[PDB]
Design a protein around this ligand. Structure first.
Ligand SMILES: [Zn+2]
Length: 196
C-alpha cells in the first residue's frame, strides 16, 4: 500500500498551486516528460508517453511539484494531469462531498460540493481539489499540526454502488493520468480518523 506520510509533508505537497490550462500543444517530448510552451513539464508513465504525440493538444490539471528558472524562463514541473483536448466532452456536475467523523456535525457533513464541467476529469484533479477543500476547512484543517484528523481516507462513490478509496495520508502516483467518468459518479465520501 502507499506509504503514509505526516501532516508536514502532506501540507507541503498539497498547498502548492496547480496548472489548469486547456488546448496546450505538446511542443517537445523527452524521456518520460511531455513539455509544453513559462514551460510546463508533465512527468508521465512510459505507457502514457506512448499515447501522447507531439503537436497534440492537451488539457492540463496538475499539482506543481517544483519550479526552476532556466535562461530567464520558468519551468513548472507536474505529474500527469493530461486529457487530450479532443477527449473533452462537456458536462455540468456538482458532486457532493460527505464528511464523516466523530467531531463532524451534520451541518458540515454535506455542505461541501465540487463542481466539474467535463465528463472526464483526471483522478488527480478530484483528489487535489478534495484535499485542498479539506485543508482550508476551519473545522478540519487537514495536514495542520493542530488538525483533528490524525488519519483517514475518502472515496468516489459510483452510481453502480462501487467505490474507489484513497488514503488521505499518502501521495498517489499521478503519472498514470487515471481519468474518472463523472457521469458514473454519485458522490464523494470522506472518512476522517478511520483506518484505510
Ligand atoms: Zn456513499
Amino acid at each position: 500500500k502507499d506509504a503514509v506520510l505526516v501532516n508536514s509533508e502532506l501540507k507541503n505537497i498539497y498547498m502548492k498551486d496547480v496548472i489548469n490550462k486547456t488546448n496546450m500543444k505538446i511542443t517537445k517530448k523527452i524521456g518520460t516528460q511531455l513539455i509544453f510552451n513559462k514551460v510546463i513539464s508533465s512527468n508521465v508513465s512510459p505507457a502514457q508517453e506512448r499515447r501522447f504525440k507531439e503537436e497534440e493538444e492537451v488539457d492540463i490539471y496538475a499539482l506543481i511539484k517544483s519550479y526552476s528558472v532556466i535562461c530567464k524562463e520558468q519551468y513548472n514541473y507536474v505529474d500527469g494531469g493530461l486529457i487530450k483536448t479532443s477527449d473533452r466532452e462537456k458536462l455540468d456536475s456538482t458532486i457532493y462531498m460527505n464528511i464523516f467523523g466523530e467531531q463532524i456535525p451534520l451541518k458540515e457533513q454535506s455542505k461541501y460540493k465540487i463542481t466539474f464541467q467535463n465528463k472526464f476529469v483526471t483522478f488527480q484533479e478530484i483528489d487535489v481539489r478534495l484535499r485542498k477543500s479539506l485543508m482550508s476547512d476551519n473545522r478540519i484543517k487537514l495536514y495542520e499540526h493542530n488538525s483533528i484528523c490524525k488519519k483517514g481516507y475518502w472515496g468516489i462513490h459510483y452510481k453502480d454502488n462501487t467505490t474507489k478509496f484513497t488514503d488521505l495520508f499518502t501521495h498517489p502516483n499521478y503519472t498514470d493520468n487515471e481519468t474518472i467518468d463523472m457521469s458514473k459518479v454519485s458522490h464523494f465520501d470522506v472518512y476522517l480518523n478511520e483506518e484505510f
